[PDB]
Amino acid sequence: VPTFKLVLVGDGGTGKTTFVKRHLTGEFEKKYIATIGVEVHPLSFYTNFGEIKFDVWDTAGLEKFGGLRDGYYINAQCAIIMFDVTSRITYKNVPNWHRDLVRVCENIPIVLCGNKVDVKERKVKAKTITFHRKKNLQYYDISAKSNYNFEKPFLWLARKLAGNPQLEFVE
Amino acid sequence: GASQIVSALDVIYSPKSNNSQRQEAQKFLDEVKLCSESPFWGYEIALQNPTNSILKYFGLGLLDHAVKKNWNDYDEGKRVALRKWVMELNFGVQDYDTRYIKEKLATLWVEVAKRTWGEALKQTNPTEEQLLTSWVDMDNNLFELWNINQSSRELALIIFRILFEDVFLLDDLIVLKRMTVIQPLCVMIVCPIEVFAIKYKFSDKWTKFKANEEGWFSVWIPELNNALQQNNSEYIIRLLETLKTCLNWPLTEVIVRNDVLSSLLTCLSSNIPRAQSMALDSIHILLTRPYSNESHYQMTIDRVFDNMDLLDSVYESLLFDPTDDIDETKYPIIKKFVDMISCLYVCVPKIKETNGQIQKYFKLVLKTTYNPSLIVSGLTLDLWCTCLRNDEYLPKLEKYVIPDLLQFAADALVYYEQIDGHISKKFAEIDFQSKSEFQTFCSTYRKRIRDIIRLISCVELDLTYDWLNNRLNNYFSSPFGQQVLSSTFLDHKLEPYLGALSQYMIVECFINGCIRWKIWYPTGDDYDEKLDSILQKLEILSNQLIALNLREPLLLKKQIQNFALFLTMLKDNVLFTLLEKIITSATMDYPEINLEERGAESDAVRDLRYACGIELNRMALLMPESLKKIYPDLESVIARIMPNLSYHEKISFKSFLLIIVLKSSLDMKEERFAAIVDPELLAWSDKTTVVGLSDLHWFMERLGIVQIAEYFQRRDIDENSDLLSIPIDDEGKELKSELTKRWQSLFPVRATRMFIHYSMQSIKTDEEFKMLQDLWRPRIVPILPYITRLLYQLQSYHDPDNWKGLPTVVQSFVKYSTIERFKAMQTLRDFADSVGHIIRYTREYTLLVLSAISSLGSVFYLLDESPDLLLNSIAIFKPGSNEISPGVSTHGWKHIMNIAIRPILKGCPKDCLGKFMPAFLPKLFEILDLLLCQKWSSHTEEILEENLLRQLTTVVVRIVIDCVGQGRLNNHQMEMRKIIFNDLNTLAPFLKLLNHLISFKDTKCSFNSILVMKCCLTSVLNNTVDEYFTFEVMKNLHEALYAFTVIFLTLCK
């Protein structure tokens, strides 16, 4: 079966490690724990066209702790730029993460995710998310606390990688 | 040993390693990164391990950390050694270096350049050593790098890309401190020395930093041209990536001298999609950049507009069939291209059309407007609107594009989101997240299409009129047109109805255009006969539409709403010939359907009639004088129509007559007013009702709960049975209809509200206002007690302690009837919900009646019983348990305060304010205090309840700030403050209410109350009030702290 290395990147404390945890187990973590270095978590999905695996690299989002800050992107085959609508600073750093990312891997599919959409006090709004409209990035509002868009990023990336828009997940 | 580093890197990058040993290796490598001599180790690793890309990248990462975090600590020797190492690594690039290695080498070079390049220029005649430390050779070194080999050429291109991005496009902190010496140096290196001399007069110390005399542009562009001819795709893409960053800032002379735009156009005509995207971005940048010399700008726009055939060919090449699967490699390019084209229209007036450039441009824009995607068309709709609304362009469009743009806009005014398999949906799954966004965008798109049609009608009225006649005639002969004409009800989700509705929206747009023509035409001597022709054409169009005898109620509603626009213009005599048709067609009977069964057909007919009433009343308000000419014929017509018109609409037409009678300067107002009104308000004074209102049991009986009990008995309904499981039957429906019909006319709250509201809707003079007050005082003052009794009953209805006297059979039904939450009934639960709806609807209309009576001013406020009557009705006290109005919904209190109390306070005349407020406010504040205290004592559906409580609190806060304002004032607040503060009886409960607001859990309410206090402290203290304030306010309690300190300092004084 195919294995695609996915690098999950985003401003620290935006919910990167909660998202991959939620995909590993249906649980949810309340604590904010600063991830140190990178966490490697093999994900897998079942689809009408068999099985695929994402070897997700959950990178640390803080300057203090990013070990090989951008060395992790080497040989990446997809990426997710994670920011949370609750704070506009995390979104303002999206272009910086995109520079750091495409600089190491040119043509990989990249998905832009707005996290923590469950809370009604979103400070990032549709009129500001045009960054994705500009960079040809696929955007999704998501929440690790709500499954409504919890599978869209991986679905889109699987379609792009497999070259098969008809691919769809099942469980 | 480096072998340790290699092992650690393998541990990190090895898939099989667990995260714990990854943490171990990472900690080791962080210590290495933090070690002394880190840059030297990085350089050694990078130079010695060219084959292992991971390890080389790690070494470069060490160097980058050194230059990016320790540049301040290093002395001169270390800094020059770092520069030497970076330059040596860059010159050593080879074909086997991966792309990211080249990117990293370029990043190192750019960092060192930003931090050292040209720092010596700030001094006068810098020494040779100062030149060396400032990296005088950088340009010469790059020129060396450019010629080493192909890989070094690509590396140099990357270096330029990153350098210019950081210097100009991004907010780099290190550059903000050096702009004055970096940016001029960039301009120097790219531009020839001669060109540079023109803008800058600097001395020889600068020119020594330049090695390529002609500047780099003389190198990149010949390279780009030679790559294009050879069709070297990769090299073209790299060159465009570098060039895209350095077209905005540099001097225009170099751009023109090298003929950059020619190369960009050649790229754009190349089949390479990446090259096309880069070239479009570059051309847009080149068009929008600031030009110091306008001759160059003229040359640029002339070059673009002379190649409109090339752009059309490019667009044709980008197009693709989207039916099966949209091509995502070219769709973004199409969006970008069409985005560029939409920005060129500002250049049109400066183009000298020698060879039909403007014609070709506008036809190209129109061609891009036909694009299947709605985003692509939405890009150009704004262009079309702006071009149409600026008189400069209209000659050009008129001669070129208007007749075709009209046809498009007409054919594009459809409901995309509801058409099955529409080609536009294919792109919706890509451009939009969810159907909500798609529908919102479709609504905006159709709005802009309607604007286009409206403006085309305004500008080209005759052409559009001929086109419209032809279109409608062709349509209503088509089989869909015949189905629409020969049918009474259509699925308003299917092709026939949607098509007919689009035709009627087009007609509406034409009418709006005709209206705008009155303002748009320059009011010359020719204006009169032109407007006469427009009126005749509109009259003919309206007669043509009427002759179709359309009966589909939901389309007939749109037809009526369109005809409403005609009459804004049409003459007095034709006014009747149209109004009679409107009235007699909207109020037709529909034997095919039994009305009041709440079926879709009955709802459509009800909406039709309600909209007809609304339009008639709106028109009467707008032009009462015109309708005076034909008023008796309107009386005759409406009398003719009354028999088959339901009460809920008898009122809506009588209000229209009333508006004409009052505001049309028609003589003998009093008798007509009596004839219109007295029959409707008569129900209030009915003696059985006057006596009945004083008993709650009679009120329940009239509401029908006794009949509900009998119905339950005849069906053997167990009071404990779950009503939701029991279905409604024929007797249930009949009883529902009977009850609602009898109730509606028993308490004519709607009739009163309509008559009072429209009567006072607009007044010209205080004399007319006095006349209206005289007309209303005899009829309202005797009735106010009964309206307040009705409200009293509706309040006491919600109290469970009250309906305890009713039969046990119906207890659950009544209890359900009080449910608050937010189609035809099917179960007894729905029946109870409908009874609750009846009660709530009557409550809302009673509140609106009380609010409307307030607008009569002296008639209401000046009464002695107004405040007691109004308050006793709302606040239902009970002996013992002092809770106010038990069982009434919090949403109910929100509506009460928002509709009745707040407008009544706001509407107090200042001559009557002396009598009303001193008797009203005390009890009002006391009631509010007790209320909010009781509800907050109790503090998903629970979250919704809390939100409603917070809403009610905000409403009370709004009332308070209206009363005394917040921390400037107006006459109302200034006048009221005298009453509030002078009357201790008012002040005490006012202070209690304010304090309770201050201490409540909601942030906004508490903060706003704190501001009110901040604005109120200095006045209240100016005896018993003082002590009460001190004690309670202090024990209760960021300007809140400021107010607390002021209170302490003042009272403790």
Ligand SMILES: Nc1nc2c(ncn2[C@@H]2O[C@H](COP(=O)(O)OP(=O)(O)OP(=O)(O)O)[C@@H](O)[C@H]2O)c(=O)[nH]1
């Ligand atoms: N409201 C909301 N909070 C979330 C959501 N997902 C995660 N969080 C919060 O995010 C925090 C988890 O911290 P992390 O996931 O480690 O933050 P991070 O993005 O991984 O950043 P680093 O730890 O620095 O790598 C918890 O406090 C959660 O409450 C979400 O979907 N909605």
Ligand SMILES: [Mg+2]
């Ligand atoms: Mg984390």
